[PDB]
Design a protein around this ligand. Structure first.
Ligand SMILES: CCCCCCCCCCCCCCCCCC(=O)OC[C@H](COP(=O)(O)OCCN)OC(=O)CCCCCCCCCCCCCCCCC
Ligand SMILES: CCCCCCCCCCCCCCCCCC(=O)OC[C@H](COP(=O)(O)OCCN)OC(=O)CCCCCCCCCCCCCCCCC
Ligand SMILES: CCCCCCCCCCCCCCCCCC(=O)OC[C@H](COP(=O)(O)OCCN)OC(=O)CCCCCCCCCCCCCCCCC
Ligand SMILES: CCCCCCCCCCCCCCCCCC(=O)OC[C@H](COP(=O)(O)OCCN)OC(=O)CCCCCCCCCCCCCCCCC
Ligand SMILES: CCCCCCCCCCCCCCCCCCCC
Ligand SMILES: CCCCCCCCCCCCCCCCCCCC
Lengths: 480, 504, 55, 100
């Protein structure tokens, strides 16, 4: 369909991020300046947030056969933009330690944010596929940005090969779904069925291959083995972006796909997703038990937390507040992961070159970085689902949503995985305060410290008083 | 209106203890003392003005004081506090033990002392919030909120003679036990709230409205089992007791941390307030299993206490056996056994506080806890062995101390309800005398078994001696004149019992 | 017979099972990209077979 | 007159052969070749489905698919060249340093 000016108003964050990509690229073409290009990128992302306010002042409508903009899309756009802004802020000191070109980083972060926004508004299989690829390829660049280092090149090769394979799986599944149902829009996948014929074998096989691709992207068992290697090998701001923005955007488009598709309330797909959620929770928590590397530990943590989110997704076509639970949990998980990966990024910045080691060495962090240790232990308590943290509010939402839908196996899985998480998260948070024998001064490092401190304060305050976040998420509802 | 201040004065006091460390390294102890004294004074003022002795039973709900303020209105969650006689007795007891814990941390002045006092005050405020909250989410929030300062007190400020990894192991075991049991309770709470929402149509976590929720016997049994698992971890009920002696042994060696966090029994109160009224039919069906678990707890705790070579683990298993007696008392339908349970909870608090303070003083004098390395200490110390003799005599169940009053009222009511269990439990009293005399013989009587015991040790200070003598006076007065406590708890206990027996 | 707490040990054995299961699951993280592709294809086979069985 | 089943079966055969080539080959270049076979097979499946319905959306999905194929072939060959110039070895089992 044609694009009216109101439709152009509803595309405002997408347009502003694309224009920021063009402007930053032309500025690099003018002169290779780190500060100006980083500033232009963060100005473009903040302008995209203000454009989200302007989009909210407009209506909720279908801008294309491809895109649909509503409060759901606005919430996920805001989450992706916050994650991208935090990634740029954490990236500046680390890139200040870098030696090669250091503005293509911000260009790639902007293009990945553009893909996240497209997935936030995606109402079509074409827009879903394109948003996944626009997330993925800049992350191929960003994970191997320090390709002279062995670990970053290894993580880049693994992520590139496995994401190309997963995109092939997703595209073949989309092709089988389109072979069954003549339309590629979300609301028409399974529409031409009735009288108990919703489980068409070709439609289920197509959704299975799409589940393979998306479950690679979400680090769900058994498509999870890439996660600790890529999280450990990637640069720490890249690990921050990969943990927050990619997972949030892909899970949002999966939420909308299962909300809108008439095949979403299928018993077979629900049982398969229940198996995947159970295995993801238990396996991620069990594999994170004996990890001394903080980044591998957060990779397995991401596996288990996406399992909890999947549990909230399974109850979507039965209950009502599954969308609200996913929103609250995703806000809490975003802020906790931003704090944890930002502490990891700040202590690993500036970049020490490809030859020097990059181990975190979090033991006894309090005796020389007390504020970062306090932020890190708040984040470790939040990822554990401890009360007085927003992670507990998300976990409580997941438990309430599971109890309402009689998903008792998943409820018991959440309880057991939470106990295992208690063990390893408390191990990290108490190793922060022990005594270690042995083993800045610019405002961008201070900006990263302020970002992790504000994330910690948000986690604590919204864990004590979660009503504002619930009220914000509840008014961000999609088209029914 | 004073209940929010009963919770908030410990939190504000802990924050001021943390902040006023810059004014001096020996400053925050005075702030902690002042705030715990303020909390105790406010509890005593609520006791005096409440008129609990003249209150007659009128049925649940019946609150002497109440406070309500919306917290999460989406789920119908509100900060909803209420106090009656049982909650008031528990709040006065935790205020008194908090003052004792501040006084026991005196003359331990190191770096980050203000954060130690902050953790202590937050544990105490969480305990008070557990005793005051009468909606499910706030009760669960206070139930799980105590575990983080407790974990960091055990792991970071713990027993300095340990390996360092043993303290972390004990603290992690405690945290995993209590938090997993709490999560099971949260599942039971959420399922009860959803059953009520399907039955009526309005979201609520309020305890008053969640009463008389129509549900089948199996669902009610499952909800009762979730609540009981959470309370049975912290009661402790065997086999879920294993966190307790490890948490006591690896606790900070002043002994104040035991009184602040481990010594009090919020789980018996939790059973009385949220298990019998919310699920009376399920509790009535579960009563034989719970009473046999109590008998097993009595005998297992006595046998474990006899076999210890460490004093702190001996006192911990003593606590396990006494809580087995209380657990037997709770699942009867006797007002007399419930009053005995209340007296036994208070008496166990006083006697275990005295025993743990005396053990901490003995350890700071002889630098070991092994009873094989100590002996003949009656001839070497001035005050400690005689007071330890008194407190072992009190935990034995001696008439003249409140432990006897509580235990024998429990046994009288239980014999009126279940005679065989009462017979076996009185033989458990014989086993209690056996382990108390074993500890006294191994520690203070005989010949010295090492060179550290063959020396004259310094006497106790005036502060430690006076707070131990305060505990002695309180136990003796509770043994000889327990009537004010019974008159305080009578109306609440009668409400619980009449709700429990009229609905079955 | 009870001087080393037996009930505590039979409540400790879930931690032993969890540690054993974690060590067993960590064998799949061998770092080999061909095994990661193979595990993705195995998961695809399992998901498709479960969907066809459940119908 | 050409069945939809036959075109989809042809695309499935090519996809499975590309996945097998991706798994069994230890050289990274042949892994990239198998990836190209897989993405071309999925694009062929989209073209078959679009031709069955008489819609232009199948060829549009093909165009997006080959845009992805071109860009990720470029990225994968750049990473292959980097691996070759840093190790003088294209064995994918040698680049396995990070492990659980
Ligand atoms: C404080 C609690 C915690 C907050 C955490 C937030 C995390 C996510 C951030 C983005 C969330 C955006 C959610 C927006 C949902 C809006 C849903 C909706 O329908 O809004 C419509 C409303 C106008 O009302 P109405 O009359 O309905 O409009 C239709 C008229 N045709 O229009 C609106 O409501 C407009 C909404 C504009 C939002 C602008 C946001 C700007 C960015 C703020 C960032 C703050 C810093 C956070 C990070 C700290 C450091 C890490
Ligand atoms: C490891 C710890 C975690 C363990 C796993 C999590 C708990 C598992 C609970 C399994 C429950 C099995 C229920 C089987 C029947 C389900 C279908 C059914 O008919 O349910 C009955 C009822 C809904 O039917 P309806 O007609 O609406 O009746 C309303 C009045 N009840 O249903 C309802 O009204 C609600 C039913 C609620 C069931 C209990 C939920 C609370 C669980 C408490 C803790 C776990 C059990 C005890 C501890 C075990 C050991 C850890
Ligand atoms: C009576 C039956 C009915 C009631 C059931 C009630 C269930 C909830 C309450 C009981 C929970 C029991 C938990 C037992 C384990 C407690 C944790 C523990 O012991 O941690 C210490 C230990 C670390 O110490 P260490 O072994 O020295 O170090 C090895 C690593 N270097 O840690 C480790 O070795 C690894 C610890 C991994 C994480 C903890 C284990 C979680 C297991 C699932 C928890 C839920 C269990 C549900 C019920 C199961 C059957 C009872
Ligand atoms: C890592 C490895 C280790 C960690 C993981 C280990 C396993 C963890 C999970 C353990 C718990 C498993 C699930 C237990 C609950 C089973 C629920 C069930 O079977 O419900 C069926 C039925 C539901 O009620 P329904 O019949 O529908 O009611 C309508 C009319 N009556 O129910 C009923 O009708 C009532 C049934 C009551 C009896 C079943 C509950 C048994 C609970 C066992 C634990 C408690 C035992 C007693 C207390 C011990 C001390 C705490
Ligand atoms: C309610 C928030 C809980 C999480 C944050 C915890 C950190 C608070 C601020 C830092 C305080 C650190 C104190 C460390 C004392 C270590 C003493 C060791 C020697 C005894
Ligand atoms: C290795 C970790 C394994 C964790 C397993 C957790 C299992 C928790 C208990 C689940 C119990 C589910 C019972 C469902 C009964 C449904 C009955 C329906 C009747 C209509």
């Amino acid at each position: 369909m044609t694009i009216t000016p109101q439709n152009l108003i509803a595309l405002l964050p997408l347009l502003i991020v694309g224009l920021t990509v063009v402007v930053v690229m032309l500025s690099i073409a003018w002169r290779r300046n780190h500060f100006l290009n980083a500033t232009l990128s963060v100005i473009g992302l903040n302008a995209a947030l203000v454009s989200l306010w302007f989009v909210g002042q407009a209506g909720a409508m279908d801008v294309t056969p491809l895109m649909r903009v509503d409060g759901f899309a606005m919430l996920y756009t805001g989450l992706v933009l916050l994650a991208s802004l935090a990634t740029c802020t954490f990236a500046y000191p680390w890139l200040e330690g870098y030696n090669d070109n250091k503005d293509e980083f911000y260009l790639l972060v902007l293009i990945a944010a553009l893909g996240g926004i497209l997935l936030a508004n995606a109402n079509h299989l074409a827009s879903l596929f394109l948003g996944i690829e626009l997330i993925s390829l800049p992350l191929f660049g960003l994970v191997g940005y320090a390709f002279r280092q062995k670990r970053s090149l290894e993580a880049s090769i693994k992520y590139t090969i496995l994401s190309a394979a997963a995109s092939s799986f997703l595209l073949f599944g989309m092709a089988l779904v389109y072979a069954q149902s003549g339309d590629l829009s979300f609301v028409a996948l399974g529409k031409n069925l009735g009288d108990g014929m919703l489980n068409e074998p070709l439609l289920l096989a197509g959704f299975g291959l799409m589940i393979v691709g998306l479950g690679f992207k979400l680090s769900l068992v058994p498509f999870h083995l890439w996660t600790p290697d890529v999280y450990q090998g990637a640069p720490a701001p890249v690990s921050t972006f990969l943990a927050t923005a990619s997972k949030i955007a892909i899970f949002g488009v999966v939420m909308r796909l299962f909300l809108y598709a008439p095949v979403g309330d299928s018993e077979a797909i629900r049982v398969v997703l229940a198996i995947i959620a159970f295995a993801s929770i238990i396996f991620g928590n069990l594999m994170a038990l004996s990890q001394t590397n903080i980044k591998r530990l957060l990779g397995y943590s991401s596996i288990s937390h996406l399992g909890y989110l999947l549990v909230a997704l399974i109850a979507l076509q039965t209950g009502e507040m599954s969308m609200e639970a996913v929103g609250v949990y995703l806000a809490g998980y975003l802020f906790s992961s931003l704090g944890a990966f930002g502490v990891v990024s700040l202590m690993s910045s500036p970049y020490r070159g490809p030859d020097a080691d990059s181990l975190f060495s979090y033991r006894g962090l309090f005796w020389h970085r007390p504020i970062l240790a306090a932020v890190m232990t708040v984040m470790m308590l939040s990822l554990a689902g401890i009360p007085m943290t927003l992670g507990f509010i998300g976990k409580f939402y997941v438990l309430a949503v599971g109890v309402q839908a009689h998903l008792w196996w998943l409820v018991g899985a959440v309880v057991v995985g939470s106990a295992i998480g208690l063990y390893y998260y408390l191990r990290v948070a108490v190793s922060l305060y022990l005594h270690a024998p042995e083993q800045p001064s610019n405002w961008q490092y201070s900006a990263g410290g302020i970002v992790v401190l504000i994330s910690a304060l948000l986690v604590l305050v919204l864990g004590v008083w979660p009503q504002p976040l619930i009220s914000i998420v509840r008014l961000a509802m999609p088209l029914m | 209106m004073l209940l929010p201040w009963l919770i908030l004065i410990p939190f504000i006091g802990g924050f001021l203890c943390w902040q006023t460390e810059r004014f001096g390294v020996k400053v925050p102890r005075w702030i902690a003392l002042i705030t715990m004294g303020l909390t105790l004074a406010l509890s005593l003022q609520l006791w005096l003005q409440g008129g609990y002795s003249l209150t007659q039973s009128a049925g649940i709900p019946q609150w002497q004081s109440e406070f309500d303020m919306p917290w999460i209105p989406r789920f119908g969650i509100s900060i909803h506090l209420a106090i009656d006689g049982l909650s008031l007795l528990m709040v006065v007891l935790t205020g008194l033990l908090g003052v004792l814990a501040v006084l026991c941390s005196w003359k331990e002045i190191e770096k980050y002392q203000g954060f130690f006092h902050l953790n202590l005050m937050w544990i105490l405020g969480g305990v008070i919030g557990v005793f005051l909250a009468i909606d499910m989410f706030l009760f669960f929030f206070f139930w799980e909120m105590m575990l983080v300062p407790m974990y960091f007190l055990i792991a970071l400020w713990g027993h300095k003679a340990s390996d360092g990894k043993t303290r972390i192991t004990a603290a992690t075991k405690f945290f995993i036990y209590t938090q997993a049991s709490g999560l099971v309770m949260l599942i039971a709470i959420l399922a009860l709230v959803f059953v009520h929402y399907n039955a009526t149509g309005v979201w609520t976590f309020n305890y008053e409205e969640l009463l008389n929720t129509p549900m089948s016997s199996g669902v009610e049994y499952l909800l009762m089992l979730g609540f009981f698992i959470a309370f049975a971890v912290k009661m402790p009920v065997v086999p879920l007791h294993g966190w307790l002696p490890d948490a006591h042994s690896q606790a900070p060696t002043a002994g104040s941390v035991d009184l602040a966090g481990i010594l009090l029994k919020t789980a018996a109160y939790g059973l009385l307030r949220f298990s019998l009224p919310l699920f009376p039919n399920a509790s009535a069906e579960f009563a034989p299993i719970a009473m046999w678990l109590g008998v097993i707890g009595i005998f297992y705790g006595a046998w474990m206490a006899f076999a210890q070579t460490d004093i702190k683990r001996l006192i911990a298993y003593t606590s396990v056996s006494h809580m087995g007696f209380v657990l037997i008392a709770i699942y009867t339908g006797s007002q007399l056994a419930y009053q005995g349970a209340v007296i036994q909870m208070i008496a166990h608090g006083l006697s275990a506080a005295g025993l743990f303070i005396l053990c901490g003083q003995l350890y700071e004098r002889i630098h070991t806890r092994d009873m094989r390395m100590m002996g003949g200490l009656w001839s070497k110390m001035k005050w400690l062995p005689a007071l330890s003799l008194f407190f072992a005599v009190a935990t034995l169940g001696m008439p003249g101390t409140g432990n006897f009053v509580g235990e024998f009222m429990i046994l009288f009511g239980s014999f009126q309800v279940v005679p065989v269990i009462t017979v076996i439990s009185t033989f458990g009293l014989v086993f209690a005398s056996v382990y108390s005399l074993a500890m006294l013989h191994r520690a203070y009587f005989g010949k010295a078994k090492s060179q550290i015991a063959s020396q004259e040790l310094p006497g106790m200070s005036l502060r430690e001696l006076f707070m131990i003598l305060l505990l002695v006076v309180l136990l003796v007065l509770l043994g000889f004149y327990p009537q004010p406590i019974l008159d305080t708890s009578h109306s609440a206990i009668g409400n619980i019992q009449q709700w429990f027996v009229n609905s079955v | 017979l009870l001087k080393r707490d037996p009930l505590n040990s039979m409540m400790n054995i879930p931690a032993v099972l969890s540690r054993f299961a974690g060590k067993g699951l960590l064998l799949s993280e061998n770092g080999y990209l061909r095994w990661y592709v193979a595990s993705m294809s195995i998961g695809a086979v399992v998901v498709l077979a479960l969907l066809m069985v459940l119908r | 007159m050409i069945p939809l089943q036959h075109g989809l079966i042809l695309a499935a055969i090519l996809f499975v052969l590309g996945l097998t080539g991706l798994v069994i080959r230890r050289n990274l270049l042949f892994m990239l070749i198998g990836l190209e076979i897989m993405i071309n097979a999925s694009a062929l499946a989209f073209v078959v489905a679009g031709s069955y319905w008489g819609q232009t959306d199948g060829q549009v999905m093909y165009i997006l698919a080959i845009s992805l194929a071109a860009a990720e072939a470029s990225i994968g060959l750049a990473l292959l060249l980097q691996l070759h110039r840093r190790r003088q070895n294209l064995n994918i089992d040698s680049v396995s340093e990070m492990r659980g």
